[PDB]
Structure 1
Amino acid sequence: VVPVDYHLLMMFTKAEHNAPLQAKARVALSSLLRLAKFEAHEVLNLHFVSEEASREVAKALLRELLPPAAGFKCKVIFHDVAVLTDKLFPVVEAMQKYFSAGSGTYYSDSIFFLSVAMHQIMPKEIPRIIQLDLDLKYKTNIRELFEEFDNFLPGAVIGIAREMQPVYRHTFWQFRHENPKTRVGDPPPEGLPGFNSGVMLLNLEAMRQSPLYSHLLEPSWVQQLADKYHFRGHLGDQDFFTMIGMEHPELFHVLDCTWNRQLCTWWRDHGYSDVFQAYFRCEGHVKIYHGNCNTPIPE
């Protein structure tokens, strides 16, 4: 047979003596591997972005979980957070001031933009990769998520689910105030609530090959849009994709909410009681739960 590689990428940093993070990783990776099934010629590659102490922690957790029950081939790859930070910085520097806590441009924030420049960081033999948070719990075979790449329309480069809280309603306040007819920051079905970065289908080939996407990475384009939208955030890649998605929704294949069912209700209690349910509603059979903002995941 001709071997077919499937690639996932997870951030796993500062994990030593971070027991809550390790437990999140355990929940995510155990459910992932329990429920995954791949054909005999297929291989699941698990990429981790980690400093050295976290690499050791991940290795101890993985040996307890591999090889998977289902018997499929799994390869673990580690990437040095310091190396990636240096590769990312030239590309990502100009966006940091708009999307990092808070001001202005620190190396320590650079890695939170990895996804936006993944197509320049990963080897060109990797055409596609799925980036996943570690505070997830998988309820289905991850192999099934890969078929969503086949549903990208021409010109779409990334697959992403909507943000299920009114955080962007809040963030875009001034733009909304100046533009009363805008859908920017409004809830679904008809609004543009923004995106959540917990589950992302990065078509590296499509990102590399898109002139539009390439232009939007340039400092002057980042600046012009952040000025237009009066945008300030601290959520990194999620904020950038959210912003360019207001201007250029064609770039994004919107995954159904069941692929990233976020559980965080922080914003409900901080000014958005009345509109909260319109953002938070998600119906369907849940495929991935996302226990964001340290929210316990139900069982």
Structure 2
Amino acid sequence: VVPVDYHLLMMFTKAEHNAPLQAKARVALSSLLRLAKFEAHEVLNLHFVSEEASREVAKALLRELLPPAAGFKCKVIFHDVAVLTDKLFPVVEAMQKYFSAGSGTYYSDSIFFLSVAMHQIMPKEIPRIIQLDLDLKYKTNIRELFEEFDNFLPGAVIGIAREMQPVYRHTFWQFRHENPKTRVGDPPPEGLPGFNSGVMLLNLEAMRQSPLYSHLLEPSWVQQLADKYHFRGHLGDQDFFTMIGMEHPELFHVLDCTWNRQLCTWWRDHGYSDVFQAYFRCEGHVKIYHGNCNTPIPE
């Protein structure tokens, strides 16, 4: 049989003596594994980006959860955060000053841009990968997320869900001020509210093969757009994709909100009471809950 691989990637760093993080990881990975089903020739590859202490923590957690109930083949892979940081830095350096807390350009922030250059980091034998936060709870078979790759229109390189708070309405304030009629930062269904990075379908082939996407990674393109949008953030990859998503929405297959149902309401209580609801509304059968900003996930 022709073995078929599926690839997931999760950041899992600074996890020793971080019980809140370990408990989140535990909820995410047990729900993922309990509900996953794959055909006999298929293998689920779980990539973790970790320094050595967190690798040990993850191995202890994983042994308790593997092999999975459903009995399919599963392979665990660790990537050294230090090695990845050095590979990312040349590509990612020029964007750091716009999207990291706060300035300027520190190695410690480089790893938060991993997804933007994932196609240069993962070996060519990996054509596609799904990057996932560890503060998720899976309500369906993760295998189903992979069929969304099929719905990418020509030119789209990444699948990503909208941001469900008005954080980008706030971030794009000046651009919105100077452009009253803009959709930039407005709520759906017709506004561009920006993106959330908790669930991302990184089509590595399409990223590698896009002239547009490659250009946007260039220092001078990053700088021109950040200037145009007066953009400053501290959320890393999420901010960069949000920004280039304003200029080039063709690059992104927008996932339905049910694939990344964000629970965080921090922005509601910081100046956005009125409009908050229009950003936060998500209806349909939930597939993944995302307990962002440390928000308890319900049961």
Smaller-chain TM-score range?
over 0.9
SS in structure 2 at match of 1:275: helix
* In 2, Cα distance between equivalents of 1:205 and 1:93: 23
- Write the deviation string for residues 250-295 of structure 1: whole angstroms up to 9, x where unpaired: 0000000000000000000000000000000000000000000000
- Write the deviation string for residues 54-95 of structure 1: whole angstroms up to 9, x where unpaired: 000000000000000000000000000000000000000000
SS in structure 1 at match of 2:126: coil
* In 2, Cα distance between equivalents of 1:104 and 1:238: 18
1:209 CA displacement: 0.1
* In 2, Cα distance between equivalents of 1:246 and 1:104: 24
1:152 CA displacement: 0.0
1:297 CA displacement: 0.1
1:17 CA displacement: 0.2
1:156 CA displacement: 0.1
SS in structure 2 at match of 1:60: helix
* In 1, Cα distance between equivalents of 2:167 and 2:158: 21
SS in structure 2 at match of 1:6: strand
1:8 CA displacement: 0.1
1:19 CA displacement: 0.2
Percent identity over the alignment? 100
- Write the deviation string for residues 8-54 of structure 1: whole angstroms up to 9, x where unpaired: 00000000000000000000000000000000000000000000000
2:31 corresponds to: 31
* In 2, Cα distance between equivalents of 1:92 and 1:104: 13
* In 2, Cα distance between equivalents of 1:182 and 1:75: 46
Give unmatched runs, 5+ long, in structure 1: none
Counting only pairs closer than 5 Å after superposition, residues 220-299 of structure 1 correspond to structure 2 as 220-299=220-299
1:134 corresponds to: 134
1:161 corresponds to: 161
1:192 CA displacement: 0.1
Residue 88 in structure 1 maps to residue 102 in structure 2: no
1:96 CA displacement: 0.1
SS in structure 2 at match of 1:17: coil
- Write the deviation string for residues 145-166 of structure 1: whole angstroms up to 9, x where unpaired: 0000000000000000000000
* In 2, Cα distance between equivalents of 1:121 and 1:259: 25
Residue 119 in structure 1 maps to residue 119 in structure 2: yes
* In 2, Cα distance between equivalents of 1:64 and 1:215: 44
- Write the deviation string for residues 186-223 of structure 1: whole angstroms up to 9, x where unpaired: 00000000000000000000000000000000000000
1:123 CA displacement: 0.4
SS in structure 2 at match of 1:43: strand
- Write the deviation string for residues 211-238 of structure 1: whole angstroms up to 9, x where unpaired: 0000000000000000000000000000
Aligned residues: 299
* In 1, Cα distance between equivalents of 2:284 and 2:199: 17
- Write the deviation string for residues 118-147 of structure 1: whole angstroms up to 9, x where unpaired: 000000000000000000000000000000
Which consecutive aligned stretches of 4+ in structure 1 deviate over 4 angstroms post-superposition?
none
1:239 CA displacement: 0.1
1:151 corresponds to: 151
1:76 corresponds to: 76
1:296 CA displacement: 0.1
* In 2, Cα distance between equivalents of 1:5 and 1:42: 6
SS in structure 2 at match of 1:199: strand
* In 1, Cα distance between equivalents of 2:27 and 2:198: 15
* In 1, Cα distance between equivalents of 2:104 and 2:136: 30
* In 2, Cα distance between equivalents of 1:99 and 1:233: 4
